[PDB]
Amino acid sequence: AKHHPDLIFCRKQAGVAIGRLCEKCDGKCVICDSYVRPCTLVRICDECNYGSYQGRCVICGGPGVSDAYYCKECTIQEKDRDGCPKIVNLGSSKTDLFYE
């Protein structure tokens, strides 16, 4: 995300699998991470959609509910035509909070 600067994206080739967002993060854009003007569906790679990882949230990794989208401001900057935006690592937040 933009808030947690240590989160890294997957960035491999985007397949045909449509991204999903959890119930806690519905309406969030994936890159600019806002709520308004969703314009373009999320296509995620086949390694980040395999088996146990199907229909899972792009950001949280929770169980997905609705489809994921990019903003218009991510679309017209063509930040959707890079790799798949599946946030891979879980780092330094929601880990120490689990230990707290």
């Binding site: 080739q13 985007a14 397949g15 045909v16 296509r43 790679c45 017209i76 063509e78 959707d80």
Partner: protein, 1189 residues
């Protein structure tokens, strides 16, 4: 300030062309790409012509295009790879007549990048995968399948990435239901860029590489990788599996090579050069086209060298392995970008410059006479297999499809004294180049002539039965002559024919089976074989006015009005209705139309009255002589017509100045009168038949045909004069047509090219015409022709004589000096066989004064061998008197890459007497190529290149008067408004320069901030300058309101001038605009900037009047970017903002696709606009009606 783009005659040059069963039937279709346009063409086999069926604007650059057939499939899907990061697979739906987008998958950022794929596109021949690949580093494989709804599906993109790797071409290796393989010519360059010795990048030969897709393992592996002992440029698929020896031919400079992996030894065949063609100092020879063909017995390849010499390559294999390849000189056509040989034996060639062609293949195979050679015959000493070029033997020309690409220079001028202006166009590359004159009318071609004396009023066209075509008679009357001529040969005045009645006649028609009605003073005739006339028409007195006939039913009037019908009996003779209205007089015209069904009355009555009124009356027996719906007209109609034109009955009145087009439906009459104008003599509306349907020829000062070409209502004029009448025509002398004269003669006409907008007429030229000027006294064109790599014909004659010399010197003892003489006096047409190419750095050039009426070389002046013209201006000096002058900027030894001129010249000519010839005056030298000449205040201004010099005449040579040296890189354009100079740099921009009267200085006082690469420009105001660039944009640079000129002459502002000018539009066109001109295309219209691009297209930029129009069309196209996205996926706002962001220009080619959606989308947009879709289509064609065609 606020503009609006429209294309008038959209682009015609073809870059890619593919063929296949796109409709889904047995017959085949061509799909071509005009670069920005994607078109479907049907090669109509019986008549041989080529008909366009659909033309869409994809708003991208179609970087590659390829059709594929799904495994066990009927229809082929088109596959488009573009500047968007999108593969997009299209299906031609014939029903709705549009390209249904099947799928659209995103794989990288957009624009014509280097890394993301889209440039090269290969497909598996069975139809299971498709590879889209870039010029560097990365390739993608999609796996195509079909699922249970017989529907196409696409997997995730497989990856075939390979770093530091060029790709020259990629192709589908046929393997019959095996793992699909793709072959590509690669090159790895990392050791070529690591070693500064330079030789490591000199021995870095290509590799043929095969990518095999493990469908079992779902990834792409480099299977084979074999180097090449020469650099191949493109590959050709060989069919295989069961059909042939599966592999890839490799075309290359002076060679063709069959390679196939595993076991085939590499088969080399050196490319046949011509016998002793005079274009080779040292130059190789490549192919440019492939054109495979699978004739269900064997397979062959119609390859093509770069001159145009088509070869018939046939693989003849003794084993399952290949044995040896062999080829022969098939034929020669102009050089093509792509070929599609067709089953049913056609050959379509798409010349990249000039006209496209469709040939019928006459002698396929051609295995009878010709000296064919092969690969594995032990021939040494280079090529050693020659061929003598020859005219056509294997092909016959059938269709010449027209194109304006490349429009190199253009003028809007009215030189031929016509009302509307004309487009004077330079066109073509090389010996196929042409000046082309374009008008707005239609191709009105006369096939026969007669000379009808007196002053005839009218003509009518009638047959024996409804079933024939000969059209047995043709009647012509003014007051007292009937003259119902025989239609065929020996057309001459008639005696009392089998249909003739009396002399003073006024109408005729076929009413019954063979029963004619002819109308005169004692009107009623009814004549089938016996002259069964019953001529009453006497309510006491009145006997002549206003006939109005149909095929089954009649309504005629007398002085009075709503009157008699005078029908017939369906088994017998005529009768009448005695129910009259008698209508206080008021009649100028009546007209009706009849339907193809109807065992009843089955028509509608329209009458036009002397008062400012027309009237429609349904005369069905229930509700007879009872008026139905009312009217409004300003002055007087003088004409009426009813017609049906589609596949709503289109009521066409005409008044004495303007014309309308209503939309009368049969029970209810919702009129919705479309309006348009037509001296202004009263118009006359005559229903004729073209192409299969009917239309109205409405006639005035000039004639106007109003025909519905795919429901578009082209109201296009005619190229002939005023003709005062019209009627239909059919005969075996010319199948359909229009006989149309009320003035002193008689013409049988044909309207041949009927879809298009412009009338091309071409005047052929020798070389590539750079630009031309217009001698304004006694209008004549003065053209400079210039071509790199070309001989001037003095060197052609010397080179031919030299060839003859060494052919009679090289051991002639044993003999044939016949060969040298026959070589000297047999001159091949260079427009047909390709011009010879004079190595490098040679430059042919001539100067041609030409009549723009007949198109004849009124004067021709050659130049020397390397002395190439670049700029021309006619002018009239001030120090000398009235006499004209011609200034021609010439360069010498230019060599254009790397650029090293040897300094140029400026020739001065006098242009005596009327302008018909051209006397030399003097020859001044100059130290860099004078690429811009411009008359200014009785002198000239010459851009030497970084140097702007004023000049004046001397009797020895030209004399400079000023000079400037602060203008940047290179001059390419100079235009003046008077007291100001606009200097177009070749790289930066427009530079304003002031010229002083008291001094002689040239002071730069304004420039622009953007680098632009300006190609041409035009002045619009005293301040603004509209210009265009090499990349495709159009800028308009308006000076700020202050910018005081008075600057007398060290810091600049940003390393430049001080008053930085500013930009008030940027717009992308996709093609290089070469001619911008401010003009008015239709009298009664308004000014509009006219751009003529390089790829043949012609467009306009149109200002908006008021902010309601601007805001309306802005919301229209802002809705259409949402509802109607472009075909390639290329985002329309980010196509028009390709290099610079768009500003204040509304793309009206997106707007005029409002008329191309299904009416659900149209109702969504129109109620989102709060209008109705006919109201929006009216408002949307008002602008094209007003400013343009």
């Amino acid at each position: 300030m606020f503009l609006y783009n429209l294309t008038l005659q959209r682009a015609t040059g073809i870059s890619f062309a593919i063929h296949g069963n796109f409709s889904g039937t047995k017959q085949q279709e061509i799909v071509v790409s005009r670069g920005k346009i994607l078109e479907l063409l049907r090669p109509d086999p019986n008549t041989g012509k080529v008909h366009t069926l659909l033309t869409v604007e994809v708003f991208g650059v179609i970087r590659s295009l390829m059709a594929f057939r799904l495994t066990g499939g009927t229809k082929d899907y088109i596959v488009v790879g573009s500047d968007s990061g999108r593969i997009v697979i299209l299906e031609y739906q014939p029903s709705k007549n549009m390209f249904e987008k099947i799928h659209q998958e995103t794989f990288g950022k957009s624009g014509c990048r280097r890394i993301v794929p889209g440039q090269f596109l290969a497909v598996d021949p069975k139809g299971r995968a498709v590879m889209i690949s870039a010029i560097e580093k990365q390739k993608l494989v999609y796996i195509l399948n079909r699922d249970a709804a017989a529907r196409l599906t696409i997997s995730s993109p497989l990856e075939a990435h390979k770093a530091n790797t060029l790709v020259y071409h990629v192709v589908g290796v046929d393997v019959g239901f095996e793992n699909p393989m793709f072959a590509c010519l690669e090159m790895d360059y990392e050791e070529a860029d690591n070693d500064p010795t330079g030789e490591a990048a000199a021995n870095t030969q290509q590799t043929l590489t095969f990518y095999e897709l493990d469908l079992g393992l779902n990834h792409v592996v480099r299977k084979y990788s074999e180097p090449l002992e020469e650099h191949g440029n493109f590959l050709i698929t060989v069919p295989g599996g069961s059909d042939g020896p599966s592999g890839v031919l490799i075309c290359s400079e002076n060679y063709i090579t069959y390679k196939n992996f595993g076991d085939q030894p590499d088969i080399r065949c050196p490319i046949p050069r011509r016998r002793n063609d005079l274009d080779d100092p040292e130059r190789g020879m490549i192919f440019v086209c492939s054109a495979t063909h699978k004739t269900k017995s064997m397979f062959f390849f119609l390859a093509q060298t770069e001159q145009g010499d088509i070869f018939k390559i046939t693989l003849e294999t003794d084993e399952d392995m290949v044995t040896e390849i062999r080829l022969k000189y098939f034929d020669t056509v102009p050089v093509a970008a792509a070929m599609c040989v067709l089953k049913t034996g056609f050959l379509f060639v798409a010349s990249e410059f000039g006209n496209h062609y469709l040939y019928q293949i006459a002698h396929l195979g051609d295995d009878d006479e010709e000296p064919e050679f092969s690969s594995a015959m032990p021939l040494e000493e280079g090529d050693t297999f020659f061929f003598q070029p020859r005219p056509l033997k294997n092909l016959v020309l059938v269709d010449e499809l027209d194109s304006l690409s490349p429009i190199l220079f253009c003028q809007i001028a009215d030189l031929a004294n016509e009302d509307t202006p004309q487009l004077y166009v330079a066109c073509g590359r090389g010996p196929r180049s042409s000046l082309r004159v374009l008008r707005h009318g239609l191709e009105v071609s006369e096939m026969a002539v007669s000379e009808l004396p007196g002053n005839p009023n009218a003509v009518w066209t009638v047959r024996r039965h409804i079933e024939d075509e000969f059209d047995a008679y043709i009647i012509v009357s003014f007051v007292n002559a009937t003259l119902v001529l025989s239609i065929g040969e020996t057309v001459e005045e008639v005696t009392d024919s089998g249909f003739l009645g009396t002399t003073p006649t006024l109408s005729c028609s076929l009413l019954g089976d063979d029963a004619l009605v002819q109308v005169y003073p004692d009107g009623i005739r009814h004549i089938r074989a016996d002259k069964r006339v019953n001529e009453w028409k006497t309510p006491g007195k009145k006997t002549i006015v206003k006939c109005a006939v149909n095929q089954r039913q009649v309504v005629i009037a007398l002085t009075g009005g709503e009157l008699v019908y005078f029908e017939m009996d369906p088994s017998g003779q005529l009768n009448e209705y005695t129910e009259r209205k008698e209508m206080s007089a008021d009649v100028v015209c009546m007209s009706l139309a009849n339907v193809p069904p109807g065992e009843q009355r089955s028509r509608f009555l329209a009458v036009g009255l002397v008062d400012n009124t027309v009237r429609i009356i349904s005369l069905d027996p229930s509700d007879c002589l009872q008026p139905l719906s009312m009217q409004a007209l300003p002055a007087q109609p003088e004409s009426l017509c009813i017609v049906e034109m589609g596949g709503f009955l289109y009521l066409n009145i005409g008044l004495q100045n303007g014309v309308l087009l209503r939309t009368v439906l049969d029970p209810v009459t919702g009129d919705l009168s479309d309006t348009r104008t037509r001296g202004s003599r009263p118009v006359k509306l005559f229903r004729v038949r073209m192409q299969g349907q009917e239309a109205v020829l409405a006639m005035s000062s000039r004639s106007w045909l109003s025909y519905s070409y795919q429901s578009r209502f082209h109201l296009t004029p005619l190229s002939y004069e005023t003709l005062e009448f019209a009627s239909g025509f059919a005969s075996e002398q010319c199948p359909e047509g229009i006989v149309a004269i009320s003035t002193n003669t008689l013409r049988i006409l044909a309207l041949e090219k009927l879809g298009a907008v412009f009338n091309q007429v071409a005047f052929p030229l020798q070389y590539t015409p750079r630009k031309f000027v217009i001698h304004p006294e006694s209008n004549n064109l003065i053209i400079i022709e210039t071509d790199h790599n070309a001989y001037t014909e003095a060197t052609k004659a010397q080179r031919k004589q030299q060839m003859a010399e060494e052919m009679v010197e090289a051991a002639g003892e044993d003999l044939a000096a016949e060969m040298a003489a026959a070589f000297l006096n047999e001159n091949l047409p260079e427009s047909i066989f390709g011009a010879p190419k004079a190595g490098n750095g040679q430059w042919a050039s001539v100067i041609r004064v030409m009549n723009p009426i007949q198109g004849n070389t009124l004067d021709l002046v050659q130049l020397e061998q390397n002395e190439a013209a670049f700029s021309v201006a006619v002018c009239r000096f001030s120090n000398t008197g009235e006499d004209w002058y011609v200034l021609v900027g010439v360069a010498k030894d230019l060599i254009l890459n790397p650029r090293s001129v040897a300094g140029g010249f400026v020739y001065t000519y006098k242009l005596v007497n009327n302008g018909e010839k051209l006397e030399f005056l003097h020859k001044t030298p100059v130290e860099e190529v004078p690429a811009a000449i411009a008359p200014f205040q009785g002198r000239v201004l010459i851009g030497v290149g970084k140097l702007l010099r004023v000049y004046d005449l001397g009797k020895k040579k030209l004399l400079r008067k000023c000079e400037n040296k602060h203008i940047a890189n290179y001059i390419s354009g100079i235009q003046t408004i008077g007291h100001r100079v606009i200097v177009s740099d070749v790289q930066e921009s427009f530079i304003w320069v002031r010229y002083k009267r008291n001094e002689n200085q040239l002071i730069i006082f304004a420039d622009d901030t953007y680098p632009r690469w300006v190609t041409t420009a035009s002045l619009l105001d005293y301040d603004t300058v509209a210009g265009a660039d090499k990349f495709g944009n159009i800028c308009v640079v308006r000076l700020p309101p202050n910018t005081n000129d008075e600057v007398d002459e060290d810091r600049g502002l940003l390393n430049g001038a001080s008053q930085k000018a500013e930009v008030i539009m940027n717009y992308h066109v996709g093609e290089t605009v070469l001619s911008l001109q401010k003009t008015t295309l239709i009298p009664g219209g308004s000014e509009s900037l006219v751009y003529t691009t390089l790829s043949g297209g012609i467009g306009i930029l149109v200002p908006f009047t008021s902010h309601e129009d601007h805001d309306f069309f802005q919301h229209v196209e802002m809705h259409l970017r949402s509802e109607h996205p472009p075909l390639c996926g290329r985002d329309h706002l980010s196509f028009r903002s390709y290099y610079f962001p768009v500003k204040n220009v509304i793309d009206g080619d997106l707007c005029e696709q409002f008329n191309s959606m299904e009416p659900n989308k149209q109702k969504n947009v129109s109620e989102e606009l709060d209008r109705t879709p006919p109201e929006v289509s009216k408002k949307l064609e008002d602008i094209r009606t007003r400013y343009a065609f």
